Amino acid sequence: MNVYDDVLDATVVSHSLATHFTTSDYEELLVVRTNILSVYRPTRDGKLYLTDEFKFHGLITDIGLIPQKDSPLSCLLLCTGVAKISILKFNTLTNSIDTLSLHYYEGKFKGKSLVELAKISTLRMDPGSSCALLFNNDIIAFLPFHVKFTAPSVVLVASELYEGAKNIIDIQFLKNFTKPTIALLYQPKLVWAGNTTISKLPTQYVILTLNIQPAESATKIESTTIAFVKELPWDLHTIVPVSNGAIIVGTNELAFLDNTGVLQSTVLLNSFADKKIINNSSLEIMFREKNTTSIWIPSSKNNDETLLLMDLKSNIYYIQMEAELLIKFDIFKLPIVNDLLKENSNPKCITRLNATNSNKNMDLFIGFGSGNALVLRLNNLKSPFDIELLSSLRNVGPITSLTVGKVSSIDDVVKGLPNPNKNEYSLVATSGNGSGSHLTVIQTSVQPEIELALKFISITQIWNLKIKGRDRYLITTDSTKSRSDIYESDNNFKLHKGGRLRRDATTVYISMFGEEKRIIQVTTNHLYLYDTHFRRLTTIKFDYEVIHVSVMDPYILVTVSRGDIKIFELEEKNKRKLLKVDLPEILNEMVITSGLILKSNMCNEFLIGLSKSQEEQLLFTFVTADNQIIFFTKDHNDRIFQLNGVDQLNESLYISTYQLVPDPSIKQVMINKLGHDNKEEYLTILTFGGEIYQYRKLPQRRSRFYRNVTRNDLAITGAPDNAYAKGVSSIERIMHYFPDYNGYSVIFVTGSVPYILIKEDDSTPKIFKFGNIPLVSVTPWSERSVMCVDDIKNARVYTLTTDNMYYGNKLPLKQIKISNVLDDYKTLQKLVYHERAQLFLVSYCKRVPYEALGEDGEKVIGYDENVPHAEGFQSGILLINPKSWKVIDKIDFPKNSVVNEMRSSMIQINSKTKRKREYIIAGVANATTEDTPPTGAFHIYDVIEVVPEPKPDTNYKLKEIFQEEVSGTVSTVCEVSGRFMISQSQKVLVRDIQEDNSVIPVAFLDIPVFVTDSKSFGNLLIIGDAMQGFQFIGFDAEPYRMISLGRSMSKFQTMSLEFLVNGGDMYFAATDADRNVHVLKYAPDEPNSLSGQRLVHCSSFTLHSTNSCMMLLPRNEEFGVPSFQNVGGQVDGSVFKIVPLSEEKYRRLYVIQQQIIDRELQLGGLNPRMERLANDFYQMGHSMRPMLDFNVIRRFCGLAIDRRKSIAQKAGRHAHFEAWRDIINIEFSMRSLCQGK
Amino acid sequence: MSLIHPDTAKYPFKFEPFLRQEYSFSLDPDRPICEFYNSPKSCPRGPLCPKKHVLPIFQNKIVCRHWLRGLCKKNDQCEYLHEYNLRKMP
Amino acid sequence: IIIQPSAASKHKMFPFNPAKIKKDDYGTVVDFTMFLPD
Amino acid sequence: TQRRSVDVSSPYINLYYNRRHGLPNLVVEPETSYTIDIMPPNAYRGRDRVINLPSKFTHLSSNKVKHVIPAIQWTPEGRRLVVATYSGEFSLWNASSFTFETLMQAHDSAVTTMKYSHDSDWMISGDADGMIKIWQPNFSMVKEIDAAHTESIRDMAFSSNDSKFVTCSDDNILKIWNFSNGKQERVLSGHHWDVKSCDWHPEMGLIASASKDNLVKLWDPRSGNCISSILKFKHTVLKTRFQPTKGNLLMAISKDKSCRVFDIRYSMKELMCVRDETDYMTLEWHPINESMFTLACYDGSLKHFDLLQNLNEPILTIPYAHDKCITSLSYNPVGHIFATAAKDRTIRFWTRARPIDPNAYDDPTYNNKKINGWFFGINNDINA
C-alpha cells in the first residue's frame, strides 16, 4: 500500500538530436533527460527556448530519425526499456505526438539467447533511411523501411549473417553504399587485461551487404560479406563510421578500417599498448568507458570532414582524415583555456545545433552526467581555436546524499520583522561527481529576499502608485472600519494630511490613469477621478457597490453587485469626462462573475481588417457563471467571441463565436506574457477551489490554446468540489500579475499559502509555494520588486533571488558551491545536519592515484612507475555553517580511506538518567584491493561552542570523542537506541557510550557478504547485503543481543534501505542495481513466512535510474500515530518519495490508476504497468497490490470535469471528493518541512 | 516533534506480542529487570510481561569461544555466556 | 510487429498480461510434455 | 604473522561507490594499480565475464590427518568451506585466510555429499551407509534420519523453496522428502542401474538424474513418474547439473568421455558434445555467469568451457591442476574463489586472474615443477 511520486524531475541529459520534428521552419533540438523528451529552439546566440516538453512512462534508451514520404517532418524512433522500438510522429493538427507502429523485440531476443540479455539494447540507423537494427547482444533485430505501410515486418538473426560473428562488441551501418551495409566488431575469444598474455589480437571485423527483401508475410535478408579482418587489438569497443570507412575507437588504439575492410593506420594513445602503420603518441589518454561519445560531421557544399571524440573527464579530441589511400591519420587534443568543462564529467551525447553551411564556427549541444548540459560554440578548427558557453541546462548531477536541515528559517527575525519562512526546513542534497560537486538545496517554498520590513501600514489591502515610477502614494484601506489612508512612500508617511481622497469608505481599487496624468479611485459605492496633485475632478455615483475593477489606459471596467457591466472611457482631449462605452445586448442577458480588460492577438484572424500576428487587440474579457470565457473588442459590432472548451477545461482551446446551468468554478482568468527572456502568452485560470490551470498559445495559429496532460509540471494547489477547503477559506486567493519581478514575468497568488508562478526560458511555467507566512495583498514596488502584507499587518518588500536559483524542475533548486577557487573538495557525499548546533556536516572524497601496497610497508611487485595508475580515495569531514555556507573546520583522513557513512546520532550517554548528546559518527573504510585484509576506522565527534575568530560563525569546532581503527572495512553506521552500530567485514558491532568517552562493543552479528546500507527504527535494524537482499535485526539492551528477525526471500544487490512503516504494520523499502524498488514487510503471522524469518516480498517497482540514498521523513497530514515517508535521490538527478497509503486510499488510487491506463491514451504507446512491473521480480509479489505511480494518477487532474467525474465512478460513490482529497494529501506530503521545531 | 531525529523509539507495531512471545524481545530495550523470573512460569504476568525476562544462558560469567566463531553446537544449553562483552573474555 | 490504426483506445499500447506462473513448494508447475527429447 | 587474505569487501566498496555516483565500471588495464578497479564477480556480465575465470592458483590446503576427501562444499554465503573426510568429519576452512583445523566428527561412515539450503539456514549431509543428517548453520543436530537409503548416498539437492529435497544413492531409486520433518514422500521408481547423480531445477519443479543405465532421466517432483529420458550417452552418466541461476541448461558427463549440454527450452535441444581422451569426473557451473562451467578430468586437467565462445573446445585448460584425479569442484557463492579437491588428499583454491602477474598461465599447476603455494607473502602476484 504505497505510492511513488517524483519530487524532482530528471535533469541529466542522456540523448540529443536535431531534426524537423514539431515544425519545419527551424532546426529543432530534442533532449531526453531520462523519460522526458524536450523540444528546444536553439536561438542565434545559443540560448535554448523550450517549445514543447513530453514525459514518457519508461526510460528512453535511444532515439532515432526516419523521414516520411511527402512530408518535411521526420518521424521519431523511440527506443525504451529492453528491446523496444516505437515510431513517433507529430500531429500538428492536435500539436501532440502520436504512435505509428510498435515493435517488441524482447521476447524474440530471449527466445534465442543462451544467457541473460543486456540491460539496454542499442539502436543503429543507416545513413540511407532504409532500415534500422536494434541489437542487444549477439542478436540483431532488423526494422526495414519502405522507399502503403511505412515499415515491413521485423526479422532478427543472431549470427546467420556471418558464421564468424560470436561475441559482438559493436554494430554500425556504413556510409556510401547503395545497399544497407553494416560493420561488425566481435571477439570470438574474449580477452581482458589478464588474458592479454595468452591470446593475441582476438578482435575481428567484417562488413556485410544486406539484401533487404521485405514481403507481405515476413522479411528475409541475404547477407553478402564485403570484406573481413582477422587480427585486431583486444581493447577495441567503438565503431565510428565515416565517409570512406570507419574508425575503431579502442581503449588504447584507434584503428582506421575503410569500406574495403583493410586496416590502414593505427594510432597509439597511452603507454599501455604495444604490437601496420602505427602512429605513436605519448599523450596519456584513455577511453576506459565501454562507449565513447563522438560527433561525426560530413563535409560542406569543398572537403572538410571532422570527427570529435570525447573523454570521461570531458575532453574533446580531434581526428583528422585526408585522402587522395588515406594519409595523415592522427589524433589531436583541442584545449580549454577557461576550463569551463571542469565541472562537467561523463558526457553522454553530442549534437550540432546550427548548420552554418560549414564545419567551422560550430554549435555543439553536449549532455553530461555530472555537470550541467552545455551548448558550446567552436569557432575555428585547426590541427585561432576557442570555446565559449552559450547556454546551460541545470543538472543537479547524481544526488548522492540527502538530509533535512535549516537553510532558510535560520534567523528568527529578519530586518526587524519575523522571518517570512520561519520554522521551515529544506531538503539539502549533494550533487555531482568531482570538481563540480556542490550542495543542492531543494526548497519546499520560494524564499524571498528582504529589502524593507516596515510595520503596520496596511489593514486589508494596499495599492502602490507610480507618478513617474517613483513609488508615491501607497494607498491602504480598511475593509472592516470602512476607512482608507493615503500615506507617502517617499520617506514621508504620516498620511498626506489631506488630499481630497474619500478616506471614509472601503477603497476597492485605485491606480494611475490616462498616461499617469490622472488618478482614479473606485470606493465601495463611488467612483472618483483625481489628478497627480490629487484634486478631485469627476465623481460617478454607483447606486450598487462595486466588486471588481479593471483598468487599462483608455478604459476602466466596473462590475457591481447585480453584475451590471459598466465600461467608461477617458476623454483624450481634456479628460474629466469618462464617457460610457457601448456593450453588446447579450451582455445584459448573461450573468458575469468576474471581468478584466485584456490585450491579445488571439482574435486577429476573425476581426475584420487585420490578419497579422502583431498588434494585439484590446479585449473586454468576462467570465460567466457557466465557466465560459467571452471577450470583444472596442468596435465590437456586437460580435462576441469565446474560448471554446474552458467550461469543461479541455486539453485544447480555440477562438469561436459565442452561442447562448450556472456552476461558477472559474474565479479569475489572466492572459499575459510569462517567462524570463522569452515571454509567451499564457491563459491562467483560478478556480474557487484554489487550483490553477494554465494554457499555452502557439505562436503559429494564435487563435488556439493547448495544454499538456502527459507532462506533469503544474503543481496541484486546490481541488474543484470544495475539497481542500482550508486553502481558500481563510484568505481570499487573488492572482496578481507582475511583468517584472526580477526580470521574470510572474503571477502572485495570495492566500494563507501564497503561490508564485515562474517560467524559465528552458522550462514550462511552475507553481511554487511562496514563503511560509500568509499573504493578503501584493503590489508592485520600485522596479523589479513587490511589497507583501501578511495577516498580522506586517509589511515586507520582496525581491526574487536569481544568483544560484533555478525555478524549473517542479521545486526551486538552490546551488550551494562549497568548493571555491582556493580549495577544491571534489565530490561531496554523506551530508548531515547537526540539529543542536544548527550546522551542516559533509564529507569530501578527493580522488588520488592508487598505490597497491602489501600488508607490510612495501608495495606489490607488479607496480609500474612509468605508467598511469587507477584512482584511489582520500576523504574527510567538513563543518559548514548554513548561515554563511562556509567551511568552519576540516579534518583530514589518511590515504585510501573513504567515508562510507556519516550520521549525526542521538547517543544515550547514561543508562540510568537516559541523557543523550548528538555526536557525529563517521564510518571510514580503507579502499584497497582484494589481496589485502580489510581495515577501517570509526570516529565519534562532538560539536562544542568555541570563541570565534576576531570572523563570525566560526564559534563551532569539531572535537573528537572517540577514535579507533578496526579490522574490516566500515561500510555503514547506524545508531540503535542510543548505541551506535557499525559494520565490519561480514560483521556488525554495537558499542555503548559512557561519560568518560569509553567505547566498548556489547553485541555483534554476522552478515553474508557486504553491508550496503543500514537503518534503525528504535531498536530494530535492517542491514542490506550486496548479494542476498537484506535482513531484519532486533537489539535488546540489558543482555545485549542481535536477534535475527528475518531475511528477504529474494536475493538482489540492494543499494539503499529505509522503513516504510505505514501505520500498525511495518515495511522495508529496498533498491537494487537493476533500478527496482522492492517493498517487503516483516509478517510473522502468515503460514508461509516461517514465523517471521522470511520477509514477504510485496511489490517490485522499476525506477528509471539507480537509487543512491534513502531517508525517513515525517508526513504532513493535511486532514488527519506519527506518519513517515521515504525520500530517495537518483543518479539521473531526480528525487522520489514513497508515501505509504491506507487501505481505502490505496483502493481508490489503484482504481483511478487502472482507469487512467485503460480509458486514457499514453504518450508513445508505453504501458506503465509494463514499464514498471515487467522486471525479474514480477512473479514474486502481490499481483493486485503494486506500487502506485503518482505520475499516472497526476493525469487524473488533467482530464475534463465530466471525464474526471466519470473516472471516479469506477469504485466508490463520492470517490471524486476523497480522490481529490488524498491526491492533495500526497502532493502536500513533504510540507512537514514547513513546520519544524 | 523533530524532523531531523524523528521519535521512533516507542511506536505501536502490531508484531510486538509476537516479538515478546518468541526471542523474549521488547520494543523498549532499556526496560527494568522483571525481578520475578527464576532460572518458566515464575513470572506472575507470564511471557507477555513488559518487564524483561532473562534466559539462564545470559547469567554465565565466561563468553563462549564457539559462539564467537558462530560454531556453538549448544544453542541455549551452553554453560558459557552467549553475549559479547569484552570485560569477561577468557 | 504492431501497426497502429486509429480505432481503439487501449490497443495503441504495448500489451502486458503475463500469465500468473503457478508455483508450489516443489517449484513452478509447468507443462511436462515440452521436455520430450523428440 | 601476516597471512594471505582474499576478501571481497573493498571491491564491493569500490563497486557501490561507482554505482551510487553513476560512474561507469572502468576497463581494467594491465597494471597492478588497476586491481582496485577489478569489480566483484557479481558485477561482471556479458562480454567481461572472462574476468570471472578462476585461472589463478592461490592456496593449497590439507588437514593434519591426510584422509581422502569425498566432497567439498562452501557455506551458503561463502564464509567457510566444509570439507568432508573419510572418517565422517566436517573440516571447516575460512575463506578469507584459508586456514583452519576444525574437525567435527559429523557422521560415522564416510560423508559423500553435503548440500546447503537456498535460504542459507540449513544443511543436509549424506554418508556411506545411507544416513542423512540435517544441520544448522552453527553445525548442530536438527534431524538424523537413519537408513534413508540402503547403500551410500551419492547426491542430493534442495528445491527452490527449500521445503523439499531429492536424494540419490548407489541404488536405482530416487526419493523425495518433506524438509520440515524429513517425512518419506513419493519414491521416483524407475531407472535400471545405480543412479549416480541428481539435481533440482532452480525455479521449476523438475528432477534430473544420471545412472549407469546410459540414460539421463527427467522426473516429476509431484507426479513421481519419469516425464522424459535422454538417450545420448554410451556409458554410465557420472553427473548432471542444471544451470544454478536460470536453469535453462542441463549438463551431463558420461564414462564415454563426452560432455553434453541440453537446452530444456526447446525439447532437450543439445548444444554441445565435447569428447575428450581422458575421463570426465565431475562438473560445476559458474555461480554467476551462465554458459560458463568447469570440467574435472581423471588426470587433473581442469577445463573451463564457454557456450558463447566455443562449442567444441574449452576456453581455458589447466592441464595439471591436481596431481591425481579431481573428485570435487566447489565455487564460492560470491564467485571470487574456486575450490578443487582430488584423490591426492589435497584441497586447492583458485581465484580470478590479476591484470599482470609473472606466473600467469605458467606455474606448477599449468606445468610440472614441484608444487607450492607460497604461504609467506603479502600479495597475490608473485615475482618470477
Residue numbers in the entry:
A (entry chain A): 1 to 147, 193 to 320, 326 to 351, 358 to 380, 383 to 441, 496 to 772, 777 to 1066, 1068 to 1237, ...
B (entry chain B): 1 to 39, 43 to 93
C (entry chain C): 524 to 561
D (entry chain D): 28 to 411
What do the paper's sentences say?
Most eukaryotic messenger RNAs (mRNAs) are processed at their 3′ end by the cleavage and polyadenylation specificity factor (CPF/CPSF). CPF mediates the endonucleolytic cleavage of the pre-mRNA and addition of a polyadenosine (poly(A)) tail, which together define the 3′ end of the mature transcript. In the yeast Saccharomyces cerevisiae, CPF is assembled into a 14-subunit (∼850 kDa) complex, which is organized into three enzymatically distinct and interconnected modules: the polymerase, nuclease, and phosphatase modules (Casañal et al., 2017). The nuclease module contains the endonuclease Ysh1, the pseudo-nuclease Cft2, and the multidomain protein Mpe1 (orthologs of human CPSF73, CPSF100, and RBBP6, respectively).
To determine the architecture of the polymerase module-Cft2-Mpe1-RNA complex, we carried out single-particle cryo-EM. We used a truncated version of Cft2 (Cft2(S), residues 1–720), which is missing the disordered C-terminal region but still interacts with CPF (Kyburz et al., 2003). We obtained a map of this complex at an overall resolution of 2.8 Å. This map contained density for the polymerase module and a short region of Cft2 but not for Mpe1, the precleaved CYC1 RNA, Fip1, or Pap1 despite their presence in the cryo-EM specimen. We built an atomic model of a conserved region of Cft2 that interacts with the polymerase module and is homologous to the human CPSF100 PIM (Zhang et al., 2020). We thus refer to this region of Cft2 (residues 525–562) as the yeast polymerase module interacting motif (yPIM). The yPIM adopts an arrangement on the polymerase module that is highly similar to its human counterpart on the mPSF. Conserved aromatic residues in the yPIM (F537, Y549, and F558) stabilize its interaction with the polymerase module by inserting into the hydrophobic pockets in Cft1 and Pfs2. Mutation of these conserved residues strongly impairs the Cft2 interaction with the polymerase module. A cluster of crosslinks confirms that the yPIM binds Cft1 in the groove between beta-propellers 1 and 3 near the Cft1 helical bundle.
